[PDB]
Amino acid sequence: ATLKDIGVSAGINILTAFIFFIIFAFLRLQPFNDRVYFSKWYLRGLRSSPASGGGFAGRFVNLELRSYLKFLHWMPEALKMPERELIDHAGLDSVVYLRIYWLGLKIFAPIAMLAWAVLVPVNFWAHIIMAYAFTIWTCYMLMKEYETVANMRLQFLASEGRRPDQFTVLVRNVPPDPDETVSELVEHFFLVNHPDNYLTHQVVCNANKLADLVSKKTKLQNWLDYYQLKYTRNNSQIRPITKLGCLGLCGQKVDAIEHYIAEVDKTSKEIAEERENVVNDQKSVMPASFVSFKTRWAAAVCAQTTQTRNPTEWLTEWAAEPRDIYWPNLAIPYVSLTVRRLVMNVAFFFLTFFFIIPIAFVQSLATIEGIEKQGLLAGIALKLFLIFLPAILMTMSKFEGFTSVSFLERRSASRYYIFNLVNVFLGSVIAGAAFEQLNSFLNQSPNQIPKTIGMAIPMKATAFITYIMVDGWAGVAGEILMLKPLIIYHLKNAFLVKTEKDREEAMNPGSIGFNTGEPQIQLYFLLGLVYAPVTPMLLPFILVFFALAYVVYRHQIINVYNQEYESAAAFWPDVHGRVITALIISQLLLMGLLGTKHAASAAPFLIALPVITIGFHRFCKGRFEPAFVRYPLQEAMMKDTLERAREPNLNLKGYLQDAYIHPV
Amino acid sequence: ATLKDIGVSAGINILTAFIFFIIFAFLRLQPFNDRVYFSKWYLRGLRSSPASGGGFAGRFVNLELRSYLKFLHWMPEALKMPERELIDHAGLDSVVYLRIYWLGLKIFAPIAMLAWAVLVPVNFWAHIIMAYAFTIWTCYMLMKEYETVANMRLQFLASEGRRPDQFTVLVRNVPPDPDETVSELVEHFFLVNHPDNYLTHQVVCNANKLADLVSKKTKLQNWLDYYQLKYTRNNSQIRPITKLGCLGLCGQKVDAIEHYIAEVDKTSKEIAEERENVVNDQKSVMPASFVSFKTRWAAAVCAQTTQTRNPTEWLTEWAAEPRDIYWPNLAIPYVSLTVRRLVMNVAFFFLTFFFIIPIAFVQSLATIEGIEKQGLLAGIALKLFLIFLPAILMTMSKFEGFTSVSFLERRSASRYYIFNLVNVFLGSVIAGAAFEQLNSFLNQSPNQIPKTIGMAIPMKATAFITYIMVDGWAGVAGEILMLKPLIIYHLKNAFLVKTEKDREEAMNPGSIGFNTGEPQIQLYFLLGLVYAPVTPMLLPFILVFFALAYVVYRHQIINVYNQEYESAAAFWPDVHGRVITALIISQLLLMGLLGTKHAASAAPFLIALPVITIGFHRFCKGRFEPAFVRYPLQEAMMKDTLERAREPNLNLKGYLQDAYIHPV
Known part of the structure; x- marks a missing residue:
């Protein structure tokens, strides 16, 4: 010491x-690692x-x-x-x-x-x-x-x-009306409260299920794509037991390749089904919308001003980037949000203090499987918990309701x-x-x-x-x-490469990771x-x-x-x-x-x-x-006036309409 | 117990x-107390x-x-x-x-x-x-x-x-410009940041001294007004020693009545002097203004929106009622305000804990004057401190900078x-x-x-x-x-009644007293x-x-x-x-x-x-x-539209101009 x-x-x-840097030097010289070394x-x-x-x-x-x-x-x-x-x-x-x-x-x-x-x-x-x-x-x-x-x-x-966000706000908790739909509510409210600069709006729909099915279609198609295109015909039709997926040749679902072909075909059928119940139904439409404005000044005003008597209704906030928008959390009411916050706050209390007790139960189980069937199991208990800490904390934030x-x-x-x-x-x-x-x-x-x-x-x-x-x-x-x-x-x-040109690109290593770094x-x-x-x-x-x-x-x-x-x-x-x-x-x-x-x-x-x-x-x-x-507001106005002089013909309407849709 | x-x-x-209620019944029946019993x-x-x-x-x-x-x-x-x-x-x-x-x-x-x-x-x-x-x-x-x-x-x-406040905001901490005056700054800023609805503005001047002199003129005129109009000519020209005022026939300033006539006349001369250095000088103009708007909607927007890159500059807040405006605290910069707040916060710590030690020094002095020259002095120490507590706390708030x-x-x-x-x-x-x-x-x-x-x-x-x-x-x-x-x-x-009709009205007993009650x-x-x-x-x-x-x-x-x-x-x-x-x-x-x-x-x-x-x-x-x-904003707009239909000819300009002046 x-x-x-x-x-x-x-x-x-x-x-x-220094050893790490030497290996880095070695691998960054070789093309087969350069894809994930020079990704950006x-x-x-x-x-x-x-x-x-x-x-x-x-x-x-x-x-x-x-x-x-x-x-x-x-x-x-x-x-x-x-x-x-x-x-x-x-x-x-x-x-x-x-x-x-x-x-x-x-x-x-x-x-x-x-x-x-x-x-x-x-x-x-x-x-x-x-x-x-x-x-x-x-x-x-x-x-x-x-x-x-x-x-x-x-x-x-x-x-x-x-940027689309600059002109748009995210109205949330739109009060329900017996006759008027969410779309009409938003339109008429912002045509009388922000008359001069209301441009268009995009009502948030609950297309989370739709997106899930489309993503699962691709997941299943690529699940056994490696297997599918190993030699085609009848290859290694593996069976990832449906409880954790993964596995492979361990369940009872042999069937075919590309995740049992007809199974990925039924996923396409489910996509079609959900499409009907997301687009043409008006009940998937969540009480939220992305109200766009003609100026960034008006969008700023809307974001930083209270709109109605109930400050928890018509919650206008500066919309985030279309790619930053976390779509699943747009379906959370104000009261629910507050409860979720409190629930996760107290769950975090236990997570930051009484986490060693459940971790010791995991360790008791680790010794049990240590006896079963080189071994040693160095780490496990707290090690893995700390690895998954950012993930646990992320899901707690998702629960709370950050959009x-x-x-x-x-x-x-x-x-x-x-x-x-x-x-x-x-x-x-x-x-x-x-x-x-x-x-x-x-x-x-x-x-x-x-x-x-x-x-x-x-x-x-x-x-x-x-x-x-x-x-x-x-x-x-x-x-x-x-x-x-x-x-x-x-x-x-x-493994599952299968690309015509450069479509299988798992080179992207994500971002810096503000949540961990x-x-x-x-x-x-x-x-x-x-x-x-x-x-x-x-x-x-x-x-x-x-x-x-x-x-x-x-x-x-x-x-x-x-x-x-x-x-x-x-x-x-x-x-x-x-x-x-x-x-x-x-x-x-x-x-x-x-x-x-x-x-x-x-x-x-x-x-x-x-x-x-x-x-x-x-x-x-x-x-x-x-x-x-x-x-x-001054900054917003400066930008607006400058841009209106550069281009005095911009149709912001069309631009801002498709800016905020989910998987459509 | x-x-x-x-x-x-x-x-x-x-x-x-019940005894108190009985005396109340008695005195509320007699006209000579009814002025201060039915004041409102x-x-x-x-x-x-x-x-x-x-x-x-x-x-x-x-x-x-x-x-x-x-x-x-x-x-x-x-x-x-x-x-x-x-x-x-x-x-x-x-x-x-x-x-x-x-x-x-x-x-x-x-x-x-x-x-x-x-x-x-x-x-x-x-x-x-x-x-x-x-x-x-x-x-x-x-x-x-x-x-x-x-x-x-x-x-x-x-x-x-x-109400004037509904259309006006109080911009504060207006950034100084070498060429433009505070008035021009406010005008041009709000003509480009809030173009559509900027109506007029009223720059706050430091007319606190002017007001003090006018108030002191009236104070001095009424100081010995009782004495002046007791029998006119040469009455009881009292001498309130200038250290606490009050007193009377105890100093050395006998002179004349109505606070030594020429003295109240020199107060009028000082009013005139200060008038020149408040109106025609442009240095009394404080970095603040009362920006009025054509609509209450725009005033609301201005109040609840940030105007410039420095959030501490151009501080637009919903203006208070012209009678609610505390004029002396309009001359406080942002940085000063923050320091004053912290100073008073720590002074309050000592006020709420270590207040008995200075009160014991006052009590030690009370025993000293108890020896000097029926006596007993029951109370004093903490009693009087608690009587003046609301006053002390009020002056601490004034220091902090609440306008x-x-x-x-x-x-x-x-x-x-x-x-x-x-x-x-x-x-x-x-x-x-x-x-x-x-x-x-x-x-x-x-x-x-x-x-x-x-x-x-x-x-x-x-x-x-x-x-x-x-x-x-x-x-x-x-x-x-x-x-x-x-x-x-x-x-x-x-005492000092001296009114032509009903001008000496000390019937008003103030309000409920939120600060104490x-x-x-x-x-x-x-x-x-x-x-x-x-x-x-x-x-x-x-x-x-x-x-x-x-x-x-x-x-x-x-x-x-x-x-x-x-x-x-x-x-x-x-x-x-x-x-x-x-x-x-x-x-x-x-x-x-x-x-x-x-x-x-x-x-x-x-x-x-x-x-x-x-x-x-x-x-x-x-x-x-x-x-x-x-x-x-919805409430504001509703009111605006309704009012614009009732009266579509209102000149809000003139109304809102004189709404925010100090003693002029």
Whole structure:
């Protein structure tokens, strides 16, 4: 646990990271992995095929040219593309996600210098003076980044090429009328409440079932497509027992290939059936619509104004991108939404505390199947639970009722942050098992809560040092290796490929993953903030994470990751708030550190620190935050007038009609 | 402390209240007090002069006709006027203030019945079952009153006769321009951002100094007007030493009458001076304006929409009534406002806890002047502090920066509630002195905080019973007596009267006083809620307060009190939230009561209770709350279209121009 041991394991993890980079160098040279290494280039049509042309050499023929730059040249190349070029290449979302790693460097590097010029030399009132300085710096940089990100968001919005969302709002909870249909309701309401600029509307229908059947048709057609086109005629007609699917040759449903041909044919028949009961029925039409407007000014007005006496009816919100729209959650009434939120909030309480008890039942079952029939089963219990944590948290957000993928990801990120605050941070600082710590803190005095955890932090700082080295150095180096997506596409292009040209494209590796990646960054923000005044040694390791992660994720954002939505950096308020949380926790734990090892002569100053931070947060929530949720009316009008001068003949009607349909 | 003693003091306080009613009967029969007993009738011009004609008989000639109805007939007469008639007579604000007393009866009477049919008979799981029922009932009635009050607010707004506020917004923090003046900025911004419906604007100037001088001119003219017109020539030229004013014949400034004539003449000269530097200077013009619109729809839009990239600039808010506008607070920048808020928040922390220490210094000085030169000085210390509490809290709100009298009163009410929660409620339940209790609770476990105060409550329930009897029975009976305003006008009509006809009118007794009266009601809501499951005996006394106060305040609202502003019940969200606070506190303290006298077999149910209450609050904050802060666009449009059909020739321009000027 000493510097020697820390440095030994640092060297080990630096070498593990370097090994990962070497394998990355090797595999990025070979065409057969280039599809899932340069994905975004083919998604943008800038790269032709795999090895800049496809199916070429440069593979194991020359292996990898043994040098130092083989595994190091991708780093300056990632940093070569200008930030603005990346705003058009990848997007604003990804460019500001990169800015969180840069924010970490911008905060923790100057505070490491301060700590290593004051704290370590004199290792107190210097502790509290440094704490004050660190918080002032964090706040200054938070405000400056809030500014830059808001300016970037507004520049993006102003340079947008007629996005449908800009002119449309999502009216929800449309009150039912005995005679008038949802369509007529929306039309007449917005023709009298927003007369001048009402353009058109698109009523949301419940075509979730229809979409499911179409997607299942393709799923079944590709289920045994590998098998179908292995040799045609009668191939390996597998039987994926219908309880988990997957399997294969284990059930009793042998039949034929392409998922028993007549079965995929009956899926087409079901599509037709549902089509009738989605299009020509008027009961599938949900109480929601996408009201489009002639101007972005009027759409902004509608979104940010209350329409009727019941504020829960006619809920007009700025519509999200057609691709960001999460269609299943458009069928949720206001009252239902509120109940669902509360249900998931209390389910999360149990998820973040009493999750080890059900995990121990899974482990009891793992020992049972360990006896049954090399074995060992290393991991399972908590390991798999943590792998599926983002998925569980995502489904909880879906339950709540967020009608946009962006907001689902943002909610899942918030939940993951709280999970990791309790189970990664406090799980290490306190030796109890989540709910054990909960009970202890409930039975602890409000002054002694901070004291217990604040006295605990300096001790296991070395444990958190290894956390950065493993989950933030080697973790991000494995991200550059992209091993999992490689394997997936290897077992898709050699399995169910069946494409005329390039239609089987499983190259896309999704996006950055705000729901998972961001909570990780924020846990390191927390670690750095908490330890900065206490033990300044954590900061160097945190900074290596931030630098490495900036470069590995920049590379991925440019080369591999492809955005699924464009929120135009609307998640920055969330990021800001989580660094503010980290700041407040840091100060509380410093009051506790110097409340156990010191009395309360410096505590009055460390009690003012949280107040200042909350005041700053409130200032930032009123200064920068509204630019991320609302369209400034001036900005909207400027864009409108400019666009109306450029093109004074645009028929926004037709454009905005088909912008918001589901699978039709 | 037994039922005998409680009943003896109840009889005493019932008799004290009855004595007060008897004196009220006497004085309301005599013309010389009728001016300050039927004030609102003369303010509405419905009553001619004092004794329905003025200066008549019915005074001490017949004293008071000895009966029972002499002091009891005003009660059914108060309840005779229909609620809607009182909406036009007094106002919606006063009619919904009365509804808070009625809400108390609507909540605590059914819960007293429940408690007196279950709890007292079996005096537990009945305790927690009753707690559940009580909270469900409170919530049901809170939701139902939120509904009725919102409906009344919207009916009022829809039936308003062209109020200036409906068409105007208050833009604040207008960004400075080197060339353009504030007026031109506002004009051009709202001609391009809200082109269609921009009507006119009225830039706020800093005419606070001008107004002060005009008000001081009148003050000085009336200072020694009594003296001036006692016998004219050379009367009693008093000398109010200029350090506290008041005094009289104690300084060295004898000179002349009417505040030394040439002195009031120089005040007129100063008025002229300031007039030049307010009107013709363009630096007195503050960065704010009152932008009027052609429609209420456009004004609503402007108010509820963000205008520019900086959400802290061009802060458009629904303008308050011209008479509600607090002019001095229009000169506060956004950043300043935020700092002022935080400063006053921390000053309130010390005000609600460490206020006894400065009060003891005042008491130390009181003993010093007690020695100096019948004496005794009963009260002083805390007594006078509590008298001036609403005033102190009001000035704190003024500091913060609320630009409307309504909002100043609402803030002062919120602060007074918190003060009384800590110093009247917890001050009685815990024997410490505010900050002593603070320290104890900080050093108490989060589970034992509720336990300590929850174990304390049943003991001094009798002390709180006497509180209702004194501050809520005899207190409200003294309100009907209106002794203080009587004395004031007696020493004004016999002092500085000097009126040609009826110009010296100090009959107006102000309004209900939301900043003081409402916190009192809410403390009794708290008491009733806290004690309902524990000791049901408090409820009868609480209900007598609610009934008596309804009738005494109804009488005052009709006969005496005159509204100074019309918020159209916009303070109901505040009321609702304070009853929700009371509910949550009740449940927390019941978990503590049954955590000391019981283990934790019923605690899991009593831990769900707060969650339900917060969930209900959130539902109500999204369902009814937005109707109190925003103008529904549909409602606005309906009113506009109707009015444009009735009168299609209205020149709103001229009407809305002079609507928002200060002393000009």
